[PDB]
Amino acid sequence: NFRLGLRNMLAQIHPDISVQTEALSELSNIAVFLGKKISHGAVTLLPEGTKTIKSSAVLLAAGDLYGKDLGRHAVGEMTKAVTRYGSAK
Amino acid sequence: NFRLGLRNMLAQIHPDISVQTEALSELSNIAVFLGKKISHGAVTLLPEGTKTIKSSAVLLAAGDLYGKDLGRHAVGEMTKAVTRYGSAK
Amino acid sequence: CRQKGAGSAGTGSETNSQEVRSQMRSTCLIIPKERFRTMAKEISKKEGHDVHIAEAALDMLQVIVESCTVRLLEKALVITYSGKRTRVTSKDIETAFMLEHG
Amino acid sequence: CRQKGAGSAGTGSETNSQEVRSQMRSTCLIIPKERFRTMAKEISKKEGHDVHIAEAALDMLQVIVESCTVRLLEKALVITYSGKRTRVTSKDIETAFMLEHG
Amino acid sequence: LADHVSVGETQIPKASTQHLLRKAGSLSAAGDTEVPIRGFVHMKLHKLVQKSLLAMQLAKRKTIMKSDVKKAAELMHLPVFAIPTKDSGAKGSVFLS
Amino acid sequence: LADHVSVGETQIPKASTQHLLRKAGSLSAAGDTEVPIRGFVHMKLHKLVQKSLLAMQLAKRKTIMKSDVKKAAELMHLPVFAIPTKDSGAKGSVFLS
Amino acid sequence: ESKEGSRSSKAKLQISVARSERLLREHGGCSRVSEGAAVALAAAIEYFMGEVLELAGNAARDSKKVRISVKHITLAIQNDAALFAVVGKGVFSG
Amino acid sequence: ESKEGSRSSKAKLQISVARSERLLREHGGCSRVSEGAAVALAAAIEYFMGEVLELAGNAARDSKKVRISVKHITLAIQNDAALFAVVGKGVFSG
DNA sequence: ATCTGACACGTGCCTGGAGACTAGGGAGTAATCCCCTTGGCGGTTAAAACGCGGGGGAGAATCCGTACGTGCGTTTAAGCGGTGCTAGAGCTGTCTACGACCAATTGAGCGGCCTCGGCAC
DNA sequence: GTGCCGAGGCCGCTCAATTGGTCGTAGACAGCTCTAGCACCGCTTAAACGCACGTACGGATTCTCCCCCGCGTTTTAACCGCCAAGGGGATTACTCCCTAGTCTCCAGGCACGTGTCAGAT
């Protein structure tokens, strides 16, 4: 489940807007299934002679699921998050 | 691939009928994709506690994918093949 | 619609033109629970006797059914308007189902 | 169709009625290979410059396009026949595409 | 659809089939609309129960719980986000009638 | 479909658009039918190439092979039984024009 | 306990059990695959490709041809309503 | 190089990175999962749940409500053409 | 009748396929707690089915302009074929970055239970 | 304005997440080889485009039929609360079936090359 992760972003984006418990469960169920469809995409594009999912595989898998404007804005946000993790570890 | 296995079946059913080489490759790709759909169905139908696939998992997976008269005749053929294998180990 | 809590839009022999406006404002299921439980146990009884149905499983079975049924009827309305007609007939629903499975 | 040693089954100019029976008997694809390769490299030029396309990949790309286009048009013919008309128009094809994606 | 309804078994009431049309936005409905609508729900419930029964049978249980239908729902490649919990049906929910 | 064609790019010829309608069993074709046909073939090839290119990028190759298209075909959940081997092109094959 | 033959010969199946087990085990679905699941999967593929080959052979014989082609395999599928539902989403080669 | 808390705080994210790593590894789709792939999938969910929450928050405020309901989520997704292409096959409120 | 070139056949082989302990895990079984399911009863009463004028949507018939089938010729380019070049796949052979596994620890997120405020009439 | 039940807040209780090491191992990189993709010219020639003639057809119009929406009445069954018995879902512990792993052996299907006959013309 992703209930506490979704509520924190709502507090950051909309400080005066809360979320129902039933609506939060549907948002968490979207977030779980969003990670599942990307995970299937990462395995499918991965070559058969490999056994590791790198960061580049998740980059290209999300570009197929997210078309045009969303896919372009996604790739910039992933790489910025990755390079923050690479210098703060 | 299942090229030799599917060719030997055609000799048993229709002794005077041959098969195109291109037709044999398409029939083999049906066999691979039929294997993929049943195996993915068997993984889905397993409980979260169990981790292995027994004969009962493939039997119920074939019943779901194959409707009505085909599904009932599927279980009879699959069970007869297992019981024959279980006595000639 | 007949359960407790909320989720009802409008009652009292409300007219058909108002019904389209009201039904887009509600969020509850529109098939009765007792008739759906009798239906759900009857399908299981034809194949396997003495099957209990969970209350949580009953709700999620009904949500999938209406969401597929409304999606079919929305597709049936498109073919009706494509034939320059405003009344959904029996052949329009059969054509709408045939266009995706057949 | 213009490829050597292909089962085209068409003999020069034919009428519209005879073209339906002839195309139901053939198995070859009906878009020329040179113009399909030209389109295949042109779209790939917008993402990755100087990408070679294998001949085996071109055949699988064309087969998927033919089967998906014919499946849409068979669905587009049903909407035309459901509206008591015998002429497939531009609205019928756009309706058939919208009924599965949208 | 046309012949999936049979006499002897319980079906949807006639008024609830017209409510399903009004949720879709239809204004006029024919008098022979109940038979295809009753057929489709009876088909979809027969499809969902048949998948759910084999998931329950393989786990050696006797009650169709929420995990059995969830494995049945995504076996048909249909994503479901309305998963019920113990707090379901509170004031206005997606599970009430 | 409606506006997926752009002036400046090579497109499907008009007689090839009509042959697509003949294989679907259509007896009469409108004169404005060439525009949605050209869009849909252009849309499906744009979808197929875009999935196949990122399959090539992850494998660090520069030529689109048959495996990259096959992985692009199964990514759209569309099974393909037409696998061109080295014996393709023999006589009346499905991969010919 | 019969060492005179393979897994397919023990179960009297023409579809090889070893290749069907390779599809099941190396599908990335589960860690462990039993012996009985390999035989059962091979029998399920074998029975219904016997159904396709029986319909394709009758279609080829009715066309006065002794060789089964792609069109004969295609024409056998929509002539059976039960077989078409399994592979209706498949690309039958243009 | 330093730790100063959890992985999600290190990558400056709000979706838990370690929970998304459990999604990849226990999926069974691959034997080995790199640490950089878990952070990338965490940023995948975090951005596009941010897009849904931003549109649902604006839809809730337009209806003079301070709590997001399931109706506001459905109206926000349907009003965006690009968001509908991803989760449009899902089941919302029957 | 006459090609032809694709399928059936013969050969080399090496990598797929089978046989024999091992032991560790996961499947099966059984007892026990108690959570949730079935059954139902008084009463509601809102919803469902039924019946009756009445008007709007669909069907039928007629007419016609114009958009498409259809020969006919002109025009353009797809393909054989053969050629030649060479960009780039395949495979081999390190080796170093890097992910799994195991030991230990703790507090972030889990549930249970009040309690006041936002949504519904 | 007013009842009200659900999100927020607060109390514990874990075991998921985290660090720190060792260990093997899998992808990055370089270099050699050679199958195959691009290009082009000749030439062919099937095929696409355009144009004139004409006929079928969808749109427009009018008219008529019939059946479905609207309203009133009546029967009836879904649902509250609240009840109770109990069937089977979790949970834990014991026992043991078998299957991944490792080593060994071997022969069967697949590629290469060649005859020859099923089918298109």
Side-chain angles (χ1 to χ4, degrees), chain A residues 1-67 69-89, chain B residues 1-67 69-89, chain C residues 1-12 15-48 51-102, chain D residues 1-10 12 15-48 51-102, chain E, chain F, chain G residues 1-2 5-53 55-94, chain H residues 1-3 5-94:
Chain A
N1 84 168
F2 279 135
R3 294 211 271 289
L4 212 62
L6 294 172
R7 175 91 181 81
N8 287 336
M9 293 182 286
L10 187 55
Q12 183 204 100
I13 296 180
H14 289 293
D16 62 358
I17 297 300
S18 60
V19 58
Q20 295 214 64
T21 306
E22 180 65 32
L24 186 62
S25 300
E26 291 215 310
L27 286 174
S28 179
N29 265 326
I30 286 181
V32 165
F33 274 125
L34 268 182
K36 192 172 293 298
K37 292 149 202 164
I38 294 182
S39 178
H40 279 286
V43 175
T44 306
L45 307 191
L46 212 54
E48 43 182 62
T50 48
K51 280 167 271 312
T52 57
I53 310 184
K54 298 298 293 295
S55 60
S56 61
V58 188
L59 288 172
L60 300 190
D64 291 331
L65 183 56
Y66 299 138
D69 301 332
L70 288 181
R72 274 171 91 111
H73 296 171
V75 170
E77 287 267 90
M78 311 205 158
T79 307
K80 264 170 52 205
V82 167
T83 187
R84 283 190 293 240
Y85 183 84
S87 71
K89 206 193 103 172
Chain B
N1 53 7
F2 287 112
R3 304 182 192 178
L4 183 63
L6 288 196
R7 188 179 285 176
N8 265 11
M9 293 177 70
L10 189 58
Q12 279 193 16
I13 296 185
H14 299 300
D16 54 352
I17 295 298
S18 61
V19 56
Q20 289 273 320
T21 310
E22 295 179 354
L24 205 56
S25 294
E26 293 179 353
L27 279 169
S28 174
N29 287 280
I30 293 179
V32 174
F33 278 150
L34 269 189
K36 281 185 179 178
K37 205 132 190 183
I38 289 187
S39 60
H40 186 75
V43 166
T44 286
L45 282 159
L46 281 193
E48 301 283 71
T50 82
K51 299 205 298 282
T52 191
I53 292 175
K54 281 194 172 184
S55 63
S56 60
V58 191
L59 278 150
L60 297 192
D64 276 323
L65 169 62
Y66 292 160
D69 306 335
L70 290 182
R72 195 191 312 140
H73 285 204
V75 182
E77 181 79 13
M78 293 177 70
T79 305
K80 193 166 66 64
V82 169
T83 51
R84 259 180 296 120
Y85 175 98
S87 176
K89 174 84 68 174
Chain C
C1 294
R2 308 183 61 178
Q3 260 188 317
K4 220 188 177 183
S8 183
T11 176
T15 62
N16 204 267
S17 180
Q18 294 169 342
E19 182 86 70
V20 184
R21 315 291 170 201
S22 294
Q23 279 295 326
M24 80 157 64
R25 217 151 57 82
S26 65
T27 50
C28 76
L29 315 173
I30 62 171
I31 299 175
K33 301 291 292 298
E34 173 82 8
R35 193 82 76 93
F36 205 82
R37 184 175 77 88
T38 297
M39 221 186 269
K41 286 181 63 43
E42 206 161 60
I43 314 294
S44 61
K45 195 174 183 178
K46 289 184 179 180
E47 308 173 351
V51 172
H52 291 247
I53 306 294
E55 190 276 331
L58 258 184
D59 291 333
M60 178 176 105
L61 276 172
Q62 194 172 337
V63 164
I64 293 167
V65 162
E66 293 179 353
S67 66
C68 291
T69 310
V70 167
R71 214 151 311 171
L72 172 69
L73 290 183
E74 291 206 280
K75 292 173 56 176
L77 184 62
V78 174
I79 300 172
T80 299
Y81 271 101
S82 178
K84 318 193 151 72
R85 290 182 277 105
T86 67
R87 172 171 318 168
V88 176
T89 59
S90 66
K91 214 62 71 163
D92 300 325
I93 298 173
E94 294 293 328
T95 297
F97 177 76
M98 190 203 284
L99 272 187
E100 65 183 1
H101 305 132
Chain D
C1 294
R2 317 185 43 164
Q3 197 75 37
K4 183 67 181 294
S8 63
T15 66
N16 189 359
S17 176
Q18 304 175 250
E19 197 83 11
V20 185
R21 254 81 201 181
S22 301
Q23 282 290 336
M24 261 185 188
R25 205 213 308 287
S26 63
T27 50
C28 65
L29 310 178
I30 61 166
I31 295 172
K33 293 288 291 296
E34 198 76 20
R35 204 171 290 221
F36 205 75
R37 183 176 76 88
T38 298
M39 293 177 70
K41 289 178 70 67
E42 184 96 20
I43 321 302
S44 65
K45 201 172 183 178
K46 286 188 178 179
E47 279 83 352
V51 170
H52 302 258
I53 310 292
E55 311 292 30
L58 276 176
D59 279 356
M60 199 180 332
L61 280 173
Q62 197 184 12
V63 161
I64 296 176
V65 168
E66 291 325 323
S67 70
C68 289
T69 304
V70 165
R71 204 151 321 170
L72 169 70
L73 263 59
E74 202 145 350
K75 288 171 56 178
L77 183 66
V78 173
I79 297 169
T80 300
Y81 275 16
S82 176
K84 302 175 182 177
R85 292 181 285 106
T86 65
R87 215 199 292 292
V88 182
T89 62
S90 302
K91 187 218 300 179
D92 311 318
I93 299 193
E94 289 195 5
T95 304
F97 178 77
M98 182 179 72
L99 277 188
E100 66 182 1
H101 308 135
Chain E
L1 275 296
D3 57 60
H4 276 194
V5 61
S6 304
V7 65
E9 65 183 1
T10 59
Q11 296 282 352
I12 300 172
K14 177 172 300 154
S16 288
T17 61
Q18 283 188 355
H19 278 46
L20 277 167
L21 281 156
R22 298 310 179 269
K23 193 132 201 183
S26 296
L27 286 180
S28 289
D32 184 324
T33 314
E34 282 82 9
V35 173
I37 291 187
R38 285 190 171 120
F40 180 74
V41 171
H42 212 73
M43 182 179 72
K44 259 286 182 173
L45 198 62
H46 182 82
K47 244 177 182 178
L48 282 177
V49 161
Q50 185 187 26
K51 308 282 183 180
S52 297
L53 279 183
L54 294 180
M56 179 256 287
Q57 184 178 2
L58 190 153
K60 311 159 194 167
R61 279 193 271 103
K62 302 181 63 181
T63 301
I64 299 184
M65 321 205 68
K66 69 181 278 291
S67 64
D68 298 347
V69 182
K70 193 155 54 183
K71 293 182 183 294
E74 61 86 20
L75 193 147
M76 321 165 58
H77 304 291
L78 182 62
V80 174
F81 307 110
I83 308 300
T85 55
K86 64 192 90 154
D87 202 282
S88 300
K91 183 66 173 66
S93 177
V94 298
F95 300 135
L96 291 200
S97 295
Chain F
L1 276 296
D3 55 58
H4 279 176
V5 62
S6 299
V7 178
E9 293 179 354
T10 61
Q11 290 288 339
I12 301 299
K14 168 180 175 181
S16 290
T17 53
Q18 285 186 353
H19 279 45
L20 274 165
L21 272 159
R22 299 303 163 264
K23 205 167 186 178
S26 179
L27 294 180
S28 190
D32 300 333
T33 310
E34 71 206 350
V35 185
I37 281 284
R38 280 196 175 117
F40 183 75
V41 173
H42 198 86
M43 191 215 98
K44 259 284 182 169
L45 187 74
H46 182 50
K47 263 188 174 181
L48 271 176
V49 164
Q50 183 187 18
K51 308 269 186 177
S52 167
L53 280 174
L54 312 179
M56 182 179 72
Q57 285 184 8
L58 183 63
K60 274 191 261 303
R61 270 187 276 100
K62 283 162 201 103
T63 63
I64 294 190
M65 311 283 325
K66 64 173 180 179
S67 61
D68 292 329
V69 172
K70 176 162 69 194
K71 290 179 182 176
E74 86 182 53
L75 186 62
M76 330 173 65
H77 304 295
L78 172 80
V80 171
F81 307 108
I83 301 299
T85 49
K86 64 182 181 293
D87 193 73
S88 190
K91 195 35 181 303
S93 304
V94 295
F95 309 104
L96 269 69
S97 66
Chain G
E1 172 264 349
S2 65
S6 296
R7 309 257 283 283
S8 74
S9 297
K10 280 186 246 212
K12 300 290 180 67
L13 282 176
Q14 298 296 140
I15 289 298
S16 184
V17 188
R19 289 180 180 177
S20 61
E21 186 177 1
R22 175 140 80 101
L23 275 184
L24 174 55
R25 180 199 306 288
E26 288 183 338
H27 205 252
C30 65
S31 304
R32 304 163 61 94
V33 169
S34 71
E35 293 179 353
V39 181
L41 176 60
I45 295 182
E46 186 264 355
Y47 177 74
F48 289 89
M49 221 75 67
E51 202 76 70
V52 170
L53 279 173
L55 283 185
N58 277 332
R61 196 209 312 286
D62 280 359
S63 190
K64 312 307 209 54
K65 306 299 179 60
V66 308
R67 201 157 292 170
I68 286 184
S69 179
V70 170
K71 187 183 72 213
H72 293 141
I73 296 179
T74 303
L75 183 62
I77 296 299
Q78 293 82 17
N79 269 18
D80 200 83
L83 284 186
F84 173 73
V86 183
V87 285
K89 277 187 175 181
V91 176
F92 278 157
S93 297
Chain H
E1 192 185 90
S2 63
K3 63 93 175 179
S6 296
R7 294 179 66 188
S8 65
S9 189
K10 280 186 247 211
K12 196 63 65 68
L13 293 182
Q14 303 224 310
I15 294 298
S16 297
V17 181
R19 206 146 302 182
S20 59
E21 186 177 2
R22 189 179 69 187
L23 270 189
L24 286 172
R25 184 191 319 306
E26 296 183 347
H27 189 272
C30 186
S31 303
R32 300 160 60 99
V33 177
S34 179
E35 299 184 7
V39 187
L41 178 57
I45 297 179
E46 186 263 357
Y47 179 77
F48 289 91
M49 291 324 317
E51 194 76 11
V52 173
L53 278 171
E54 180 144 50
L55 287 186
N58 288 340
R61 205 202 311 271
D62 283 332
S63 295
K64 286 199 279 224
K65 308 296 178 58
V66 305
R67 208 167 291 179
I68 281 183
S69 178
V70 294
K71 199 70 190 42
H72 299 153
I73 301 175
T74 307
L75 287 181
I77 290 185
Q78 270 164 29
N79 277 342
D80 193 86
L83 276 179
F84 188 92
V86 185
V87 301
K89 250 188 176 181
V91 171
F92 283 159
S93 79

